[PDB]
Amino acid sequence: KSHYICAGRLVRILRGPRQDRVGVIVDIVDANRVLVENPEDAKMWRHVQNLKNVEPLKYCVSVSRNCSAKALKDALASSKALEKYAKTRTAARVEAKKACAVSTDFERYQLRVARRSRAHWARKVFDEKDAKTPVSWHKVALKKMLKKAAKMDSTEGAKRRMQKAIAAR
């Protein structure tokens, strides 16, 4: 289910100068604004954020409205919300986006060969499995044609044509 905007809710900033940073709701002003703060982020001191610019995460620390900086820091460290968030796939995707954004031409080359290497080995593994259990279009077509072909070739006339036109080759 969706995550509510509550005191202690962890959020990610969608757009603006703090894009892709995490904070704590800490307080609610009205239907449109909140007071976000994160002690562990340098640029995430207590400030006002519009609710349209925040993405509510799944973690809620136990704090009261308009809590002190020390109370927030202790609750954050105790709850382990940031450590739990770091292990999820969305956090990894966010970090990887920064890596791509600051990547050089050499790093782009390294990713390209790494992805192509995985692509090559995926093709190898797929071919090995597809030989045994036909799942591709060509292997399925071959497996359906094989039974009729063997029957059509096991005749005397088929043998004569095969042998004559092969020995000619």
Binding site: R93, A96, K97, Q110, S117, R118, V125, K129
Partner: protein, 221 residues
Amino acid sequence: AFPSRKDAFRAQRKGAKKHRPEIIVIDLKDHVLGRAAAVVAKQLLLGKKITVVRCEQLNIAGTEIRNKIKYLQYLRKRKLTNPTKGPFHHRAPSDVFVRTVRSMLPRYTKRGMKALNSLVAYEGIPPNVVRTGGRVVIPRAQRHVCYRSERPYTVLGNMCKHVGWKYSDVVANLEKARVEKASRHHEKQAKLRDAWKSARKEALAKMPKHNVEVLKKFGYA
């Protein structure tokens, strides 16, 4: 539309392979009529070849009654002395979308006509479009981000059916058959999709380990 024998002969003489122009297929389902038409018209003027499908599922804000009345007011306008040469009131939803795009275009210039002729409109998804490639949407012209859900809204096919469109049932049955065929074919090839997914998974254990580390760094492993 049928190619001439001269064109077929020239293609055979040249030995060229089958050619398809760069065409964008837009699924117009739950798309705002004016916003989609404005976006399409701008892209047509920029030189894109655009084919729109499922025109009968476009949306207009407001109740169906007031939208039907608006079309009926449009229908009543005709050249009194000679209704032929008068305004031509097309009832098909695809024709409705084409007219909306046309009004957004400078239709009385060769450049405007070229942009207009670069657009093809369909009700539902015809077979020649089904397998051409992935369909697209217009995020800024989508109903679920444009209309407040409380407000009533009109479906273009329902509006057109009561003002003169006669093929609503034909399109509905064709769409039902197409989805059933697509669902059966999507039920098939699932083994192929699953096999490729497992093949990619097993590639990590067979590929160089530093290549894996690069993939993890850029969030692909």
